[model samples]
Structures are given as structure tokens and as C-alpha cells.
Target: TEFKAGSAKKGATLFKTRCLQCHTVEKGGPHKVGPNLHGIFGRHSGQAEGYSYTDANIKKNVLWDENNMSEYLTNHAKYIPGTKMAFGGLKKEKDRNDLITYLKKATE
Candidate 1:
């Protein structure tokens, strides 16, 4: 997959600029406006322990993996309608790839 080849180095930069405000990746990190993304990949949508998700997010029982995340990051509301996620979406493929690669490492 293209995401597998992304540069974690670049991804880290992307995360800092794009994700650090609303989320966190450190273990035991506190939740911000968004959930603490300590372990988002391989977890179920809306299952982060303390975050109160919307009905649409909770009801969308999909595991977070490379493929699913690719689509979701392209458009969160489209992937899970009525979700409370506020960002418009990362429309560029390379950006999503780098971000996903960074997430797999940081969130794991």
C-alpha cells in the first residue's frame, strides 16, 4: 500500500502542524477537543475510552486500518455521517499517507 511507504519523519512534521491541536499521541495523553489518539489504528471507531462520540460515530462499527483510514481521512463525515469531527479533511493522497504512517507509529 502507498501508505506503508510514507516517511514517518515527514509524517511527524505533518502531525505537529495538522493534528497536535485537537489530538495527542503520547501514551496516557489527555483528550483534547478530540480523543487522545494513543491507539487509534486497529481500534474500533468511537471506542476511545473517555471521548463522547456522536451516535453516528458509535454506531459505525468499523475497525481502523490502512484502507479504511485512507477513506476516512479523505472525509470523516462522509465515512461516518453525523460524526462530530470538525476538520474538513485531508484531501491530498500523499498527505494522508504521511499522516497515517505517522499515526501507526505514534499511536501504537
Candidate 2:
């Protein structure tokens, strides 16, 4: 199931606190620990260049969608074995929902 109902305002704050260290929403932002998440949703896994990714992320075919995002945020390695998104996953459903909401708005 997808969690689409969330406050983008709250989501924004949540993202800044928890995700900004590894991601960037603005165009041309530097790639830190992870690639810039200027537009991550709907994008195919392993689509970006230069960033070294785990075998699973580079080899497996997965599309970025609501369910995928939710699952991924809960466990990066478990979501896709060998993937390199090292930040531990978020446990709270509300936080995941809010983060997704924020990503959707920023990416779109």
C-alpha cells in the first residue's frame, strides 16, 4: 500500500533534518554520500552516472514509486541487497509518509 496523505510542510522539515546530508534537490547540487536527489521518484534505479553503487542497485531493475520509496526508506540494504544507501532507514510510518510527500513536491 502507498502512503500518500501527508503534510509537505512537515515533510520538508523532516527531510532537511534526516536526508539533506546525502541528497540535494536543487539543480547542480553536489553529490555527497549519495547522488543528488533532484528528481528521484519515478526514476529507474542505477540511472545516475559516476556514483559507485552496490551490485544489486546496479544490476537489479526497480522503478522508484511510492511503495518502493516507502520500503527503501525502511531498509536500504534490505530493500535492495548490496545497495549502498548507508543511512539507516526510517522506522516511523508517519515520517516515511511525510518524507515521500516532500520528495514528490520537490521532484515534481
Candidate 3:
């Protein structure tokens, strides 16, 4: 995959469209079916407080980062099989990049 810089603005829009129903980016935001994403970057998978996660994610033990996030968003089931997340991967490379950029900006 090509490493292309993404727009936070566009990413924000996509996040709202694609993830807001399941996730949240605000600090202390309500945790929906998915975990809150406010501090996801650099955090270990399945460690978001108050969220119950599957053993698959807990055992992954990988810290969230730009590249890792991009890869996960590109193919989440491949990243962590038997996980609870039901949404399909972001099929568009640019959308995944943009979402990652937005996550970095919002979570940092």
C-alpha cells in the first residue's frame, strides 16, 4: 500500500459517517458497542477501559500506531480474527488513510 498523507477534515467526515454509530472520539465519551477511540493511538488493543473485548484482541498485545491502524482498518478480521467487531474493513485505501489521520489527530 502507498503511504499517502490524508486530510483530517475529510477523515473526520468519514469517521462520522462510518464509525460514529459504533465508536466515539471525545475524551470520556460514551462507549457504544465499540470502544471509545479518544486515546486509541499508542494504546494496546482491547485495553480501552470499560469495554469488554474478546480474547483474540486481548492476546494481540500490539500497540496501536499509524501503520498498524492502517493495516487493521484495511482488513480487521485479518488483524484480529474471532473479534467482536462486526463492521467490514474500509475498502478504499484513501478512506483508510484518512480515517487513520483523523484518529491520530483526534486521539492525540
lDDT (CA) for every model shown?
0.69, 0.68, 0.71
Writing each residue's lDDT as its tens digit, candidate 3 over 75-100 gives 56756846556667657767767777
lDDT of 1 by residue, 80-102 (tens): 75646556766776776787777
Question: Lowest lDDT 10-mer window, candidate 1?
Answer: 74-83
lDDT of 2 by residue, 1-108 (tens): 568757988988887777767776544677677767655555576655655556576466777777777667654665575645556656777776887777777557
In model 2, residue pairs whose N, Cα or C atoms come closer than 3 Å (at least 3 residues apart or on different chains), thus clashing, are none
Off by over 4 Å in 1: 1-4, 26-28, 84-86, 90-92
User: Candidate 3 overall Cα lDDT vs. reference?
Assistant: 0.71
Better of 1 and 2 by lDDT: 1
lDDT of 1: 0.69
User: In lDDT terms, which candidate is top?
Assistant: 3
| Most accurate candidate by TM-score | 3
